[PDB]
Design an enzyme around this catalytic site. Structure first.
Site, PDB file in Angstrom:
ATOM      1  N   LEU A  72      58.717  -5.656  46.535  1.00 21.13           N
ATOM      2  CA  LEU A  72      59.953  -5.233  45.899  1.00 21.13           C
ATOM      3  C   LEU A  72      60.014  -5.827  44.500  1.00 21.13           C
ATOM      4  CD1 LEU A  72      62.853  -5.400  48.529  1.00 21.13           C
ATOM      5  CD2 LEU A  72      62.030  -3.373  47.325  1.00 21.13           C
ATOM      6  N   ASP A  73      60.407  -5.003  43.530  1.00 23.44           N
ATOM      7  CA  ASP A  73      60.358  -5.426  42.144  1.00 23.44           C
ATOM      8  C   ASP A  73      61.295  -6.612  41.931  1.00 23.44           C
ATOM      9  OD1 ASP A  73      58.443  -3.669  41.037  1.00 23.44           O
ATOM     10  OD2 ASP A  73      59.926  -2.053  40.945  1.00 23.44           O
ATOM     11  N   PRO A  74      61.050  -7.416  40.895  1.00 23.56           N
ATOM     12  CA  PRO A  74      61.884  -8.610  40.700  1.00 23.56           C
ATOM     13  C   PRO A  74      63.362  -8.296  40.597  1.00 23.56           C
ATOM     14  CG  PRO A  74      59.942  -8.750  39.327  1.00 23.56           C
ATOM     15  CD  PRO A  74      59.903  -7.392  39.970  1.00 23.56           C
TER      16      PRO A  74
END
Lengths: 328, 128, 47, 91, 61, 335, 90
Positions: A72-74
């Site tokens: 999951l992206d930051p």
RNA sequence: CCUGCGGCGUGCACGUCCCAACUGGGACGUGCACCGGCCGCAGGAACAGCAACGGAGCGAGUACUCGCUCACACAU
């Protein structure tokens, strides 16, 4: 419960087996083995990255190894499966899991009606080209414009997509198609495989409080609510129940053989990923089927399935191969 | 009546005009009938005009079966940005086009004689 | 923040940008509270 | 510079400073690939390829004295035949 | 055309020449839509059909 | 409980079990879980025939749409007649001949030149044309074909037009039946419309699809690379053989049978009770694939009470050669 | 040359003279029919009915009218223009 | 001997025009379908074998390779 649900609905090959005192039920394992064979459905916070949100869990739980089944992206919240120790063996199998997100998109210019956005989302369906953000084909199964604010020019749409899909690229493409442009200002994964927000989602505060309650009060209720057995990640897999005398052979690399199958499930096709399950509900391994269900209902011997990834540890059940009716 | 008549229509009979809009559409078609080339009637003519690039408002009949004869044309109109809307019945469209014979769908162009109504109806549909 | 939600009779998340739900009750934010590892308020929250 | 040229596709619409071209040739263009005119006149560079696997579009960022209102409906666009891949490759 | 039908409770076709079925609803034509081999409206047909939940893929079984 | 298993595995447990001993081979797929290429190559379509074209035109159109080498059809519907039309695709084309004798139910509209006394007259006239009737082709070798049942579904007196449903044997010309019914009523008559409501075990409720459905499925498979539509459209050829008695054979005998070997007893796993001599049966694999159509030369009792001898004689090999490996000649007696 | 009894008059569907058949042989197409006096009245137009109890409709010349024959009128046909019934049986 | 394969001017749809429905008519162009026996080729000549000597668990390099350990299991 977990993996014995509707076991009588399965095709019974034989009932006769010698039960052994070894093994534990998936949900009645001790606290030291519950954590090692468990996964957490974390509600990821906004800022931290997924490898740092998984390092936090590893440090918190004092576990030797911990993995996750999708990055999951930051800046992206949502479902995050964190496998603890013995469950990490399933990470690879979890890469293709279907995902469901709810995305918020802001359009640079305005549209005439919500119908324009609905049609644009309609034409962004099926297999679509996607390029990783700063060329692959990935499938969007469904989509639905949940809301739209014209004054803000910002909308909410729920999307069912295949693993690996970039919702940033999909939102950019939705902007491009509508003739006004657009980009995504917010994302939240609302379901990851067979697990969603209703399916036992716990905040990172919940994990912290559970580990803390365990340390300072020796209470495992909260931690068992927080952590779920890995058998819950294979509920969508087709099952092949084997006898207590065949589990250890499978654990040592032996192929699943017909004389040891206690029950098998309708709809098993060749080259199909299945789950080997004991008579107590544990997950012995993930296997590849080399026989259709009919070929198993109509044969007395052979290889019902070859192994793909052994989950159970060796020596969990006693060595009991070579003591069959022949023993020759 | 009207609620029953709209009831008989097919499930793809959306967007649908209310009663008042239905009277307005019948008035628009009757006024547009006076001009030979500014009203297009029938499935084939309407489809050909959409293909060529003609513009206007397209009025469908919601009580048709099988739907595969016209189910695709709503999407063509959507693609070319041509407003369209269903109406309760085909007999009403025929009665509004000066022909007792029914017409499955029709296409109305813009003329200076009835611009105001033709753009009131357009606005009314766009708000639906 | 942008994403808010409410719940129906089945307890399912309905996503909206509105501060007031259809039933008049406020909409709850869809994002969890920010986390800091150096949080010494576990006992107070439990209480 | 372009030894040969083939028709990449036809025109789509405009989205800000970009020119969407509907690609007819099955072959998937390269990234940062110059798009030429009939007379071997590069007009822009490829920015984004989007859509399904057989009816898709490509946006070009007109750069050198090229603009969006310059082109018009029904115009065709060309590409270097060496700057393509087979559609099968990506699939 | 001439033939028409209405569906009974069991789901069977009850054939008749009447325009209105005994239940008051219109009678559906028995004959399928004409087909043109050069039909370029497949995409335009799946968007609408999916939009209204009538496509075969959306039916049970 | 195998009563719900797809296609040729129905009531698989109720079949008499000859033996359970063999080594299954990993070659082949289930009929419904085949790859798309093989699924199309071994499939058939129940098509609502459009009113205008001819059956041969419909078959060629399906060929062009699906891009298949071969395709055929069992019964020919006149150009203006709609209804059921089973079209085979590249490998079910071997089953076209077996479908030629299938029963047919039509629903036909007729017009009488002059009015009749009352509806009961038409009912009696229809009740007089239910047998091994006499039929000459329309515009000449007079044949005899049967009309099992018939019913006057509707009759509008103002227009003198009626609609009747007829079950009849293959090759029967319902236009001739309508002209004969006209002659019978004493006023004369003719057929206005015709609609095949069933071709064999296939009817209007049995998953009938339109040509638009076929075209749309092809588009969805060639643009979105999706197969569900094409799988709802095309169905495995084993759906055409669900009324046949079944003989399951071991995987070592499949390639022999494909090459022409007769179905021998030493390689039969299961069989369906009620098989009589000179009966059409389907030789099937344990995966559910119909290897072939054969003609039985052994009764069920004989098949249970024997150890050798030819169980069936080949009539039509359906399975492609080299689909399974060559395993004939390695047994004890064979060497 | 000679004739044999074909059957008796039933009804008339316009010009067509419908003759019920009592023999077990099915005639040809356009096979000429003749009365007792070997006078030709028409040619066979259609063959219909059940396999055994069947009828033949015959087309007459301007030489005759269908109503010209009364109920019970008997017909004669050529014995050299008939087929065996066993031929058309399965 | 068995099997598989091949040979022995009408309508339909589309596009464009005239006129007088989900239509029938015409004209002008495209495509699409039609008006049991014999022969040739090829495959095989088939009594239907095979109840374990290639799998698993670890670490490293670029789906593959390189090393170690475990067993080589038909499940009474």
């Amino acid at each position: 419960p977990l993996l014995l649900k509707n076991f009588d609905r399965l095709n019974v090959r034989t009932n006769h087996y010698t039960p052994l005192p070894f093994g534990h039920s998936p949900l009645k394992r001790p606290i030291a083995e519950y954590v090692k064979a468990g996964f957490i459905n974390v509600d990821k916070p906004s800022n931290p990255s997924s490898h740092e949100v998984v390092s936090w869990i590893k440090r918190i739980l004092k576990v030797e190894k911990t993995g996750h089944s999708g990055t999951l992206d930051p800046k992206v919240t949502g479902c995050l499966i964190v496998c603890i120790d013995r469950a990490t063996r399933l990470v690879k199998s979890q890469q293709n899991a279907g995902k469901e997100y709810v995305a918020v998109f802001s359009l640079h210019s305005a549209v005439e009606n919500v119908k324009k956005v609905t049609q644009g989302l309609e034409k962004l369906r099926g297999a679509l080209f996607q390029r990783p953000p700063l060329l692959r084909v990935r499938s969007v199964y469904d989509s639905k414009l949940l809301d739209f604010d014209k004054d803000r020019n910002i909308g909410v749409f729920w999307v069912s997509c295949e693993a690996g899909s970039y919702i940033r690229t999909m939102c950019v493409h939705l902007g491009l198609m509508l003739g006004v442009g657009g980009q995504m200002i917010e994302l939240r994964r609302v379901r990851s495989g067979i697990q969603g927000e209703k399916e036992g989602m716990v905040t990172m505060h919940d994990i912290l409080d559970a580990q803390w309650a365990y340390e300072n009060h020796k209470d495992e209720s909260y931690l068992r609510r927080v952590i779920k057995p890995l058998e819950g990640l294979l509920v969508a897999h087709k099952r092949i129940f084997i006898k207590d005398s065949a589990v250890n052979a499978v654990c040592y690399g032996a192929k699943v053989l017909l004389p040891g199958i206690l029950r098998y499930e309708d709809g098993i096709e060749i080259d199909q990923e299945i789950v080997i399950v004991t008579t107590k509900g544990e997950a012995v391994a993930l296997a590849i089927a080399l026989m259709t269900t009919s070929t198993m209902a109509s044969c007395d011997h052979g290889v019902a399935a070859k192994l793909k990834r052994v989950i159970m540890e060796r020596d969990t059940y006693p060595r009991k191969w070579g003591l069959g009716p022949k023993a020759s | 009546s009207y609620d029953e008549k709209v009831d008989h229509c097919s499930v793809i009979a959306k967007p649908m005009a209310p009663k008042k809009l239905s009277k307005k559409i019948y008035k628009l078609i009757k006024k547009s009938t006076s001009h030979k080339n500014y009203i297009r009637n029938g499935l084939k003519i309407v489809q050909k005009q959409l293909r060529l690039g003609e513009k206007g408002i397209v009025f469908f009949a919601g009580d048709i079966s099988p739907i595969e004869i016209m189910c695709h044309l709503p999407a063509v109109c959507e693609e070319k940005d041509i407003p369209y809307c269903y109406t309760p019945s085909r007999k009403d469209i025929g009665a509004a086009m000066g022909t007792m014979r029914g017409c499955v769908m029709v296409l109305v162009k813009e003329h200076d004689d009835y611009k105001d109504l033709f753009d009131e109806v357009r606005g009314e549909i766009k708000l639906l | 923040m942008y994403l808010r939600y409410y719940l129906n009779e089945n307890g399912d998340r309905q996503y909206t940008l509105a501060t007031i739900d259809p039933y008049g009750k406020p909409t709850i934010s869809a994002h969890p509270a920010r986390f800091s590892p150096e949080d010494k308020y576990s006992r107070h929250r439990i209480i | 510079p372009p030894e040969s040229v083939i028709p990449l596709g036809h025109y789509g619409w405009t989205v800000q400073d970009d020119l969407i071209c509907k690609v007819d040739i099955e072959d998937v263009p390269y990234f940062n690939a110059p798009i030429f005119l009939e007379n071997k006149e590069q007009i822009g560079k490829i920015d984004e390829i989007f859509g399904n696997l057989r009816d898709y579009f490509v946006s070009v960022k007109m750069g050198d004295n090229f603009k969006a209102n310059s082109f018009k409906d029904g115009q065709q666009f060309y590409i270097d035949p060496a700057k393509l891949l087979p559609l099968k490759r990506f699939l | 055309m001439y033939l028409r039908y209405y569906l009974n409770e069991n789901g069977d076709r009850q054939y008749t020449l009447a325009t209105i079925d005994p239940y008051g609803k219109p009678t559906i034509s028995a004959h399928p839509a004409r087909f043109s081999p050069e039909d370029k409206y497949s995409r335009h047909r799946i968007i609408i059909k999916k939009r209204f939940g009538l496509l075969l893929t959306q039916q049970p079984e």
